[PDB]
Structure 1
Amino acid sequence: HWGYGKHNGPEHWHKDFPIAKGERQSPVDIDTHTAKYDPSLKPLSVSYDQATSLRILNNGHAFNVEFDDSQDKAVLKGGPLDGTYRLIQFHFHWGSLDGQGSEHTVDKKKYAAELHLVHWNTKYGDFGKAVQQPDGLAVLGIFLKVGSAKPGLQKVVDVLDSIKTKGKSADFTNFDPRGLLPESLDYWTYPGSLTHPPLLECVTWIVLKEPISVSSEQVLKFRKLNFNGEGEPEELMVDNWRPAQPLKNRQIKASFK
């Protein structure tokens, strides 16, 4: 099955998922000088006041913090979007060392990690229908750099010991994803895809300019997770990022100058 290794990683995905070589794949390098400032782009509206986290899951690739998406409680709107997108989960991608881990790059710079908050367009009724549509998902991407600790991350870090291995989950209620946001909501945006299989070309990407800072200790706890299941040979969960893909016939727009 697919993964991040030599034998099943990004360079192999196209064999089971041909859309890997498609026209709107993600992530991409963001060339800051080429990105067009678009004064028509609206401020991002992030309304997470009523977010209901339920559970955290080690799915063998990363960990997902899941939300109750059975009502409009945690939604993304505005920005480049038309209509309302409901938060379903967030997860991260990270490296074996602090010099790699992000999926998007900025002028070829790699950050230590990247957070993806995944939302689906309510006009399609459910996530599985939304991913079949070119405007089905809005993913908010946030870079992580290593420096000061992120206090709002610590609850996530401290549950990871209980989901070390693939297929482990744990109750994870009352977590507030607002604590993972940077000060500014300035962004870049472009049409793309899921960054892991099935690689569906259904995402409006919204990548924030301002990274969050996490501590070295925080990131080191990410790197103690396992890709393998309980009892299986230990393979540390590191380098679970897809590299930048060709931009092809796409324009990256900036909300800011």
Structure 2
Amino acid sequence: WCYEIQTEDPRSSCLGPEKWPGACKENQQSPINIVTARTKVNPRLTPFILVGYDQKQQWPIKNNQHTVEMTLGGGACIIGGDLPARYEAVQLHLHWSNGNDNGSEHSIDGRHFAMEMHIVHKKLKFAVLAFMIEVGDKVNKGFQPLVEALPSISKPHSTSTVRESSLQDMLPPSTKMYTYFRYNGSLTTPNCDETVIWTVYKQPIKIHKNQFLEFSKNLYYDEDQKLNMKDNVRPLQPLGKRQVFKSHA
């Protein structure tokens, strides 16, 4: 399987998003488009309890042929937030594109952002905290460790390490983590298992244009390093019957 952009090469054809196996063709899929005015409020959607996000560590990263995957291994976890149980933070990655728009998978009122960061949590089924990233005129110190380590994982399957930093510094301030949307869905990559509880935050994280451009300039999809990594996003999926909730009243 590969993203649309990967099937543009005359030779070496492979399965585009429209031809993905597994549960990819099912009913409840992700991403989705959030229509703010149609969301129902649910009081129970109170801010999450972040355990271990304040711990600085050396995070092992790698180019997994689809994105930059940063392994967390349970050094942190989330409790509460109307979740069924406690979830251990397993990994983190991002989806991005060419410009300031049409780079995020989900969209809030038809608007796409520059990138989208996904924090996957394994039920101690999947709790994925999705954040939108916007490009700004200010350097975001919290994203510096990741940016600096990209030049090392240029080649697919490369492995490296990010200097001492915490998950907290990458996320927006806690006073901005009040408003979010919640809905049942699935992974946005094969086999697209429909066992995910999504939490997409309203407030985006802001990084500088140069930190942004650094991703596609350094990462590659293939061994020969001919295709720079970008447009690694899956197109919007139909809402179907499910409802999308908002933490706010």
Check 1:49–1:96 CA distance in 2 against 1; reply closer, same or farther (3 A cut).
same
Check 1:84–1:162 CA distance in 2 against 1; reply closer, same or farther (3 A cut).
same
Task: Report the AA paired with residue 11 of structure 1.
Answer: E
The TM-score normalised by the length of structure 2 is: 0.90
- Cα pair 2:92 2:117 within 8 Å, conserved: yes
Q: Which residue does the alignment assign to 2:211?
A: 218
CA distance in 2, matches of 1:251, 1:204: 12
Check 1:77–1:51 CA distance in 2 against 1; reply closer, same or farther (3 A cut).
farther
1:167 aligns with 2:157: yes
CA distance in 1, matches of 2:59, 2:146: 12
- Cα pair 1:52 1:68 within 8 Å, conserved: no
Match of 2:49 among 34, 45, 68: 45
| Deviation of the 1:172 alpha carbon | 2.9
Q: Aligned pairs, how many? A: 236
Q: 97-106 or 45-54: which moved more? A: 45-54
CA distance in 1, matches of 2:148, 2:94: 15
Q: 77-86 or 104-113: which moved more? A: 77-86
- Cα pair 1:52 1:67 within 8 Å, conserved: no
- Cα pair 2:149 2:161 within 8 Å, conserved: no
Match of 2:185 among 173, 192, 195: 192
Pairwise CA RMSD:
1.6
CA distance in 1, matches of 2:156, 2:216: 14
SS in 2 for 1:156: helix
- Cα pair 1:24 1:191 within 8 Å, conserved: yes
SS in 2 for 1:5: helix
The TM-score normalised by the length of structure 1 is: 0.87
Task: Report the AA paired with residue 252 of structure 1.
Answer: V
Match of 1:248 among 231, 240, 246: 240
Q: Which residue does the alignment assign to 1:3?
A: 3
- Cα pair 1:115 1:142 within 8 Å, conserved: yes
Sequence identity (%): 35
SS in 1 for 2:44: coil
CA distance in 1, matches of 2:59, 2:101: 32
Give deviations 1:19-38, integer Å, cap 9, x for gaps. 21212111100000101111
SS in 1 for 2:29: coil
Check 1:181–1:226 CA distance in 2 against 1; reply closer, same or farther (3 A cut).
same
Give deviations 1:39-75, integer Å, cap 9, x for gaps. 2322222221347554101011100111133xxx401
Task: Report the AA paired with residue 199 of structure 1.
Answer: C
Match of 1:66 among 67, 71, 96: 71
Q: Which residue does the alignment assign to 2:103?
A: 101
Q: Post-superposition, which runs of at least 4 consecutive aligned residues in structure 1 deviate over 6 A?
A: none
Give deviations 1:131-177, integer Å, cap 9, x for gaps. xxxxx110000000110222100110011000101010102353311
CA distance in 2, matches of 1:44, 1:3: 32
Return 5+ residue gaps in structure 2 as ranges. Answer: 8-14
